[PDB]
Design a protein around this ligand. Structure first.
Ligand code: CLA
Ligand code: CLA
Ligand code: CLA
Ligand code: CLA
Ligand code: CLA
Ligand code: CLA
Ligand code: CLA
Ligand SMILES: CCCCCCCCCCCCCCCCCC(=O)OC[C@H](CO[C@@H]1O[C@H](CO)[C@H](O)[C@H](O)[C@H]1O)OC(=O)CCCCCCCCCCCCCCCCC
Ligand code: KC2
Ligand code: KC2
Ligand SMILES: CCCCCCCCCCCCO[C@@H]1O[C@H](CO)[C@@H](O[C@H]2O[C@H](CO)[C@@H](O)[C@H](O)[C@H]2O)[C@H](O)[C@H]1O
Lengths: 178, 165, 165, 170, 169
């Protein structure tokens, strides 16, 4: 189970339209590290957006000094920007501490001690299948989070508001080219 | 390096003013030719579809059980706003099914764009090699002409000027 | 356990600035003490989180004294509000477990608690090392946290639930 | 190890038709069909139990049609209540599933998911759980057919049938 | 097995000496002990559930106008079930006792394993088998004590605790 054959599954197989696998072989490790990192971050982001638009929110005040509740934070793109500056500073400080000490971003192979639910998959084919599942879900989540953000920007309403309004058909509505 | 490989014609031969394939990468040329042929087939379907949709020809019956019929659907981009949402989803789902499962090479073809897969064939082996190349060139050039034609039709729908008598 | 490097992780590895370790026996004694302290402090920290989150049982802790579970303080003085009979029962259970079921004389700290596939150590020794180090480090962090909680309640006079309010 | 799979007590190798000897080459696809039907029937039986226990989502299945999740009939007529777009979405999703992700042409039924994400290393335990799956699928096929026939003949869903007390057919 | 059930502080505890004498009956005696341990553990959990009033919402027997709440939480709860209900219980457990998980299988290994899997480590497997046996013994004693306490006091465990009648003095 080497890194070069991971992420090449059906139906596309080794899918490199740019041909960078054969002309830039030395940068593949860093590129796959970036791809896996983005995939994990985007999977977390997609789950977070699904949680937000379902109104699964904490009870209380995120910043009682600012008189701001968790429910006051928007469920769309502006939600992270609605957090107080001190809260954003704490979030980025903790995330940087994690990415520098606990899960060093310099660890390109992505093996941060833990495995899949804490277990190493001793079966080679099963290990490869689960790594490919991680990569494919990361790619799908990258596309999904990009689509969610772009759709929110274009429609001007969050995912929950868009779904409540019934704004699903891009053609019959009066907005945009269609 | 890329002369006379089905893109060359007597008026102009290998015509790559941008030099997008002049490097000589066979995989990139195959991808570009696949895109060109796919666009050409879609456009040569779209040209006749648009032409007979604007001519007033409509599929007989009702497009939906609620009462709306094919005759009520207008011509051009306005048609998409009047197709039932279930009907639009069914159209997109059928096209996606074709893209994912049907319109692809699974058994390996002798060139790019051959989707026969040994399942559906009308006797392409009856043609000789020159006739096969002639048919491929006809398909490709019809695809290019139809691409530009459907582009013109979609442009002039938005313009006040119409190219149809 | 010293040879396995248990408890020596990043950033500072084998960290004994005062030279307390002189042979294997003193390390075994100190590691047993540290592990018991870590387990107790982790339980204490989980208890403090539960208390200051307001998650309390419904009913009376001692109906004879009319003491509800909600009347117990969430601070360091909460346990001392438990009636002496209840404290005696708690001490009896703790003594029974720590003398018979999980005897404290077992300096190895291993009592056969295996979680099946969650401790697949016969084929994943890396899991064994990771879990031992995680247990020790969480115990150290919880010891520091419970010391800090006690210090906060002493210096401010108010429990963690109302110190953050 | 597939020919001896699904052979359990008290029947052992039960083949009254003699098709294990008449058509030995058709057994692979017949077992694949049996396993697929068993899985589908197990899911269907769980679905019927969930429906008749009135475990339904809150809201509208299709707000445009003003169709609550609770408005869908519990019995065999519940599939009719789903609008055309919903059925089209189900068909598209399961076409994708059963042609790409878990192809129906794989007659071994092994799609890489294992049993709760794991591969059973012990051959006897794996065989035992495969036999459990097959026997449960057979029982679920019989049960779902019985539920459908009982609803059709009685004219009422399982919830209505139990609530009315019409259990004994005499 | 012979070494199963041997645990500190008692070790091999055979006060009446039925291990060195008549050793051929040990297999069935251990099967009976394990069966009773499992049954008594289930019974103790059932009593705890009953007296905490975790009950199903509805009617146990609508024809008899009997609700799950009407079933006593003590030893009289099994007597409140209708005859048809008891017959259904007996039929289902005749199936689960003769066909599935036969009681004649004295080793107790019905293929379900421990939470669906086999314990690969022999030491861990032996330890958990000893845990099962000791918990079964504790639950046997506990269920007998609970029954005797309810019979003598005349009130269920919930009623016994709520009334404060804990000390029998
Ligand atoms: C003018 C346009 C045009 C031309 C010349 C071609 C030509 C070709 N296509 Mg093609 N195609 C087109 C449009 C066109 N296509 C469109 C619009 C689509 C999208 C629907 C496709 C989708 C498509 C696929 C998916 C595939 C082809 C393939 C082929 C090649 C094999 C032909 C074959 O099987 O032998 C045919 C042999 C015969 C003897 C012909 C039989 C006579 C026909 C069946 C009766 C029609 C007679 C009638 C007078 C014609 C009416 C024309 C009218 C519709 C305009 C051939 C080079 C296949 C390929 O590359 O395989 C090599 C392949 O896999 N095409
Ligand atoms: C990762 C997967 C994913 C998924 C499941 C969705 C899902 C959705 N997106 Mg979306 N999106 C994604 C990624 C994704 N997005 C990405 C990566 C982007 C770019 C960053 C976008 C950008 C985007 C925009 C800008 C919009 C959506 C919209 C939508 C919603 C309606 C989609 C629809 O009906 O369009 C159907 C479209 C297709 C199936 C694509 C086919 C396009 C072909 C090539 C041509 C079709 C046009 C053609 C000229 C007409 C042919 C007619 C013929 C079919 C008869 C739906 C919830 C729309 C929405 O919510 O508004 C109501 C909307 O406006 N998305
Ligand atoms: C989807 C559209 C598409 C695609 C992918 C291609 C792809 C290709 N064409 Mg092609 N072509 C097209 C449409 C397309 N064509 C149309 C509509 C016409 C009619 C004018 C032609 C006429 C044509 C000729 C006459 C020749 C090719 C050739 C080629 C090949 C090499 C040239 C190249 O690098 O691409 C061309 C570059 C692009 C398609 C990219 C340009 C896109 C930018 C954004 C400009 C878009 C402007 C637009 C009008 C708006 C390549 C496989 C040559 C060949 O096959 O020789 C072997 C050749 O001789 N094409
Ligand atoms: C055998 C498969 C099958 C079946 C049973 C149906 C059934 C139906 N289709 Mg249909 N459809 C199919 C395949 C099928 N389709 C395929 C393969 C395509 C693409 C080629 C379409 C494209 C299509 C469109 C474009 C529309 C329908 C519509 C409809 C519905 C009629 C109106 C309605 O929903 O009343 C209630 C009807 C339930 C219509 C619809 O849903 O309108 C609401 C509609 O407009 N269909
Ligand atoms: C060493 C740690 C420690 C200590 C000293 C205490 C002490 C106390 N807890 Mg407590 N608790 C702990 C850990 C601890 N807990 C943990 C880890 C949990 C999570 C399961 C809880 C969950 C908990 C609840 C839900 C409640 C208490 C309550 C109480 C108070 C009444 C005694 C009682 O009913 O205990 C009960 C103890 C337990 C249920 C868990 C003990 C498990 C041990 C540590 C193993 C008392 C001050 C009650 C109270 O009055 O709150 C203010 C109450 O309602 N605790
Ligand atoms: C899979 C096992 C299974 C189980 C547990 C049941 C259970 C039941 N069936 Mg039944 N049934 C089954 C399979 C099963 N069925 C199959 C495979 C068929 C198709 C031949 C039927 C056809 C059937 C009919 C036609 C009727 C029942 C009825 C009944 C109920 C009355 C019991 C009785 O003796 O009536 C027999 C009972 C809930 C009766 C019912 O619903 O009550 C009126 C009834 O009339 N069943
Ligand atoms: C398995 C362990 C176990 C445990 C934890 C208890 C616990 C208890 N028993 Mg008990 N008991 C047990 C086994 C057990 N019993 C057994 C095996 C028997 C004989 C079959 C009894 C017979 C028994 C009687 C007869 C009485 C208790 C009573 C009691 C309660 C008061 C304690 C007392 O004074 O005892 C003595 C207490 C809840 C008393 C009670 O319910 O308090 C009112 C009471 O009257 N028990
Ligand atoms: C499949 C199911 C999921 C479909 C997701 C669709 C996402 C795009 C949505 C979109 O384009 O909206 C439809 C878009 C944008 O729709 C816009 O909606 C606005 C209101 O919100 C306005 O109405 C605008 O006028 C309108 O353009 O319209 C287009 O014309 C799109 C042109 C094509 C863009 C690229 C499409 C890519 C499609 C997916 C490709 C998947 C490839 C998979 C390969 C598998 C190989 C085995
Ligand atoms: C350490 C874990 C622990 C266990 C395993 C355990 C088991 C049992 C059993 C079963 C064997 C019985 C039968 C029993 C009975 C009573 N318990 Mg325990 N009990 C534990 C802890 C506490 C604490 C902390 C308190 C407490 C109480 C009471 C009272 C109330 C008397 C009254 O209100 O007069 C009664 C009757 C409270 C109390 O002591 O009141 C002064 C109280 O504070 N218990 N308790
Ligand atoms: C098979 C699994 C499945 C998937 C994976 C899936 C995914 C998505 C996604 C992608 C994230 C969106 C955005 C989406 C949206 C809508 N769905 Mg799905 N859907 C599935 C199944 C069904 C069924 C069975 C029904 C249904 C419906 C609707 C309606 C209501 C329209 C309306 O307001 O009337 C809307 C807007 C109902 C229906 O279409 O009724 C007309 C209904 O019956 N859907 N659906
Ligand atoms: C939704 C989330 C539900 C909670 C999921 C809990 C974890 C279940 O997830 C499942 O864990 C098991 C633990 O046996 C892992 O299974 C693991 O078993 C052992 C180690 O235990 C390894 O030899 C094996 O290779 C590995 O797969 C699976 O790979 C994972 O799919």
């Amino acid at each position: 189970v080497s890194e070069i054959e991971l992420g090449a599954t059906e139906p596309l197989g080794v899918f490199d339209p740019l041909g960078w696998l054969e002309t830039e072989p030395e940068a593949f490790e860093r590129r796959r590290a970036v791809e896996r990192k983005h995939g994990r971050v985007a999977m977390a982001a997609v789950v977070g957006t699904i949680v937000h638009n379902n109104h699964i929110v904490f009870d209380g005040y995120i910043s009682p000094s600012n008189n701001l509740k968790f429910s006051d934070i928007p469920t769309g793109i502006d939600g992270i920007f609605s957090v107080p500056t001190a809260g954003l500073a704490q979030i980025i400080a903790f995330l940087g501490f994690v990415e520098l000490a606990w899960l060093p971003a310099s660890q390109y192979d992505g093996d941060y001690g833990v495995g899949y639910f804490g277990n190493d998959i001793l079966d080679p084919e099963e290990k490869a299948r689960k790594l490919n599942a991680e990569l494919n879900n990361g790619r799908a989540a990258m596309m999904g989070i990009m689509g969610n953000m772009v759709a929110e920007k274009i429609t001007g309403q969050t995912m929950y508001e868009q779904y409540a309004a019934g704004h699903f058909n891009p053609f019959n509505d009066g907005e945009g080219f269609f | 390096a890329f002369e006379n490989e089905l893109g060359a014609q007597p008026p102009l031969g290998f015509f790559d003013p941008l030099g997008l394939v002049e490097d000589g990468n066979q995989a990139k040329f195959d991808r570009l030719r696949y895109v060109e042929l796919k666009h050409g087939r879609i456009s040569m379907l779209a040209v006749v579809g648009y032409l007979i949709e604007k001519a007033g020809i409509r599929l007989p019956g009702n497009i939906s059980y609620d009462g709306t019929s094919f005759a009520d659907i207008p011509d051009g981009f306005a048609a998409l706003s009047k197709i039932p949402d279930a009907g639009l989803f069914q159209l997109f789902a059928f096209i996606g099914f074709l893209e994912v499962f049907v319109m692809k090479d699974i058994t390996g073809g002798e060139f790019v764009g051959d989707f026969r897969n040994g399942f559906i064939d009308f006797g392409w082996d009856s043609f000789d090699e020159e006739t096969k190349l002639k048919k491929r060139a006809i398909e490709l050039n019809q695809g290019r002409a139809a691409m530009m034609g459907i582009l013109a039709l979609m442009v002039h729908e938005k313009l006040g000027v119409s190219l149809l008598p | 356990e010293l040879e396995d490097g248990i408890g020596a992780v990043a950033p500072l590895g084998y960290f004994d600035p005062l030279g307390y370790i002189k042979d294997e026996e003193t390390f075994i004694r100190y590691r047993a003490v540290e592990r018991k302290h870590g387990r107790v402090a982790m339980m204490a920290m989980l208890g403090t989180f539960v208390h200051n989150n307001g998650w309390t049982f419904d009913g009376y802790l001692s109906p004879s004294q009319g003491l509800k579970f909600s009347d117990i303080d969430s601070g360091i003085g909460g346990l001392f509000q438990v009636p002496p009979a209840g404290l005696a029962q708690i001490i009896l259970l703790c003594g029974f477990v720590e003398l018979a079921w999980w005897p404290a004389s077992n300096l190895s700290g291993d009592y056969g608690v295996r979680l099946g596939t969650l401790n697949d150590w016969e084929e994943q020794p890396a899991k064994y090392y990771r879990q031992k180090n995680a247990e020790l480090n969480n115990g150290r962090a919880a010891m520091m946290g419970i010391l800090g909680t006690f210090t906060h309640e002493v210096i401010t006079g108010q429990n963690f639930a109302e110190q953050a309010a | 190890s597939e020919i001896e799979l699904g052979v359990t007590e008290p029947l052992g190798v039960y083949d009254p038709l003699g098709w294990l000897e008449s058509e030995p080459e058709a057994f692979e696809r017949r077992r694949a069909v049996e396993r697929k039907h068993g899985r589908v029937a197990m899911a269907a039986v769980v679905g019927t139990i969930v429906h008749n226990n009135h475990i339904v989502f809150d809201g509208y299945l299709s707000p445009s049609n003003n169709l609550k999740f609770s408005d869908i009939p519990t019995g065999v007529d519940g599939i009719r209540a789903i609008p055309t777009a919903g059925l089209a979405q189900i068909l598209a999703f399961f076409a994708l599933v059963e042609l790409a992700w878990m192809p129906a042409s794989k007659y071994d039924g092994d799609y890489g998911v294992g049993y709760f994400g794991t591969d059973i290393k012990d051959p006897e335990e794996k065989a035992r759980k495969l036999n459990v799956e097959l026997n449960n699928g057979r029982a679920a096929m019989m049960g779902i057919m019985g539920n459908m026939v009982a609803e059709v003949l009685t004219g009422q869903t399982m919830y209505e049938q139990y609530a009315s007390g019409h259990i004994s057919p005499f």
